[PDB]
Design a protein around this nucleic acid. Structure first.
Lengths: 54, 48, 31, 55, 98, 45, 20
RNA sequence: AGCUCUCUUUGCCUUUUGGCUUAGAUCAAGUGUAGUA
């Protein structure tokens, strides 16, 4: 259990990707928001990436 | 409705202070009571 | 020097500097 | 049998409920027993037979 | 007293009793736990696993007999048959199949 | 002066404050800025 | 076990508890 | 085939936004110069 906790914290300590958060709990909440809302909001993310059409 | 104004190499002081204030306010999370409680916990640990 | 800057500031830049700017006992009595 | 058991292991990775995980951990712990000490159980069976016949 | 039917609290308290080598306390605790929650197979599985780890094969058998009195799912019957098949004992496994 | 043409720095601070605050709070977003009203920031958005 | 726990309570030493 | 090492994958939520009302209610700001040496 301690080894799994340490490994999860170490894998959560990596800054791979775009940053949006400001705190650690903010980072975890934004990761959860991703894990639920990509399949409904990927089109909006595309619209934000392009800087044009909805 | 107009698109934008391009930046300069030599920024004026107003953009510098506005960006600094935006950085300072973009990270604030706690209120007065939470900050006071954290400071009082630090002071209590120091006194102990 | 009013030419456009090569490194244009974005909002995630503001987020990046927003993130970065956030016992033994001698005796049994104190135990 | 090995391939179908590993396929069942892969199909059972997702959390269904708690009794399924209980059975999984019990099977894992019984596997981590190793082989039982059958010779030992032979000795306590004979010893208990001896004392029960004396009783 | 605050959380009577919490299985996690029961599991952690039996574990905390076991890791300090209080065997009889923890066996009383497991009896209380399977009395309070007879339909949680996690507690029964821990109870048979603990009394198989400590030797004590007739004790594991009588715990399995109580569990079979409660008429559990097929997994517990298969576990009981595997217990009796591991230590020889095939005819008693035949009554378990009956 | 309250108003004027919009710069890229003001636009990015507007986007960052929208990120941190939302669309139903324009007074805070204008308080990050210096030369723009809450209504002007809302119109620019 | 009650007596053994009483003995372990009466002989506890906070010296090796500091290391995990 | 099994045991171990590292890596990947799946599962994983592991601390992963205590309420209510009239979006509770409001909310521009000092100044900022320099004929002649």
């Amino acid at each position: 259990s301690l080894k799994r906790r340490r490994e999860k914290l170490a894998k959560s300590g990596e800054e791979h990707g775009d940053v949006t958060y400001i705190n650690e709990k903010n980072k975890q909440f934004n990761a959860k928001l991703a894990r639920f809302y990509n399949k409904y909001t990927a089109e909006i993310r595309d619209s934000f990436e392009r800087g044009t059409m909805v | 409705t107009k698109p934008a104004r391009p930046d300069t190499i030599d920024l004026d002081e107003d953009e510098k202070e506005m960006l600094s204030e935006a950085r300072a306010r973009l990270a604030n999370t706690q209120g007065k009571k939470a900050k006071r409680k954290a400071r009082e916990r630090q002071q209590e640990e120091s006194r102990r | 020097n009013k030419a456009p800057a090569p490194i244009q500031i974005s909002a995630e830049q503001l987020l990046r500097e927003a993130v970065d700017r956030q016992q033994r006992f001698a005796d049994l009595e104190e135990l | 049998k090995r391939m179908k058991k590993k396929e069942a292991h892969r199909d059972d990775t997702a959390f269904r409920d708690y009794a399924r995980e209980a059975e999984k951990t019990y099977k894992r712990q019984i596997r981590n027993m190793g082989a039982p000490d059958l010779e030992k159980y032979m000795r306590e069976k004979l010893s208990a037979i001896e004392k029960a016949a004396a009783a | 007293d605050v959380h009577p039917n919490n299985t996690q609290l029961w599991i952690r308290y039996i574990e905390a009793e076991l890791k300090n080598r209080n065997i009889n306390h923890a066996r009383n605790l497991l009896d209380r736990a399977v009395t309070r929650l007879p339909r949680v197979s996690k507690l029964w599985y821990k109870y048979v696993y603990v009394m198989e780890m400590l030797g004590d094969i007739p004790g594991t058998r009588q715990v399995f007999d109580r569990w079979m009195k409660w008429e559990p799912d097929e997994d517990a019957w298969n576990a009981y048959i595997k217990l009796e098949k591991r230590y020889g004992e095939y005819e008693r496994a035949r009554q378990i199949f009956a | 002066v309250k108003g004027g043409v919009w710069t890229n720095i003001e636009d990015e601070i507007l986007k960052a404050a929208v990120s941190k605050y939302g669309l139903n709070q324009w007074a805070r977003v204008s308080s990050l800025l210096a030369r723009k009203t809450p209504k002007q920031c809302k119109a620019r958005w | 076990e009650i007596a053994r726990n009483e003995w372990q309570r009466a002989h506890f030493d906070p010296k090796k508890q500091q290391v995990g």
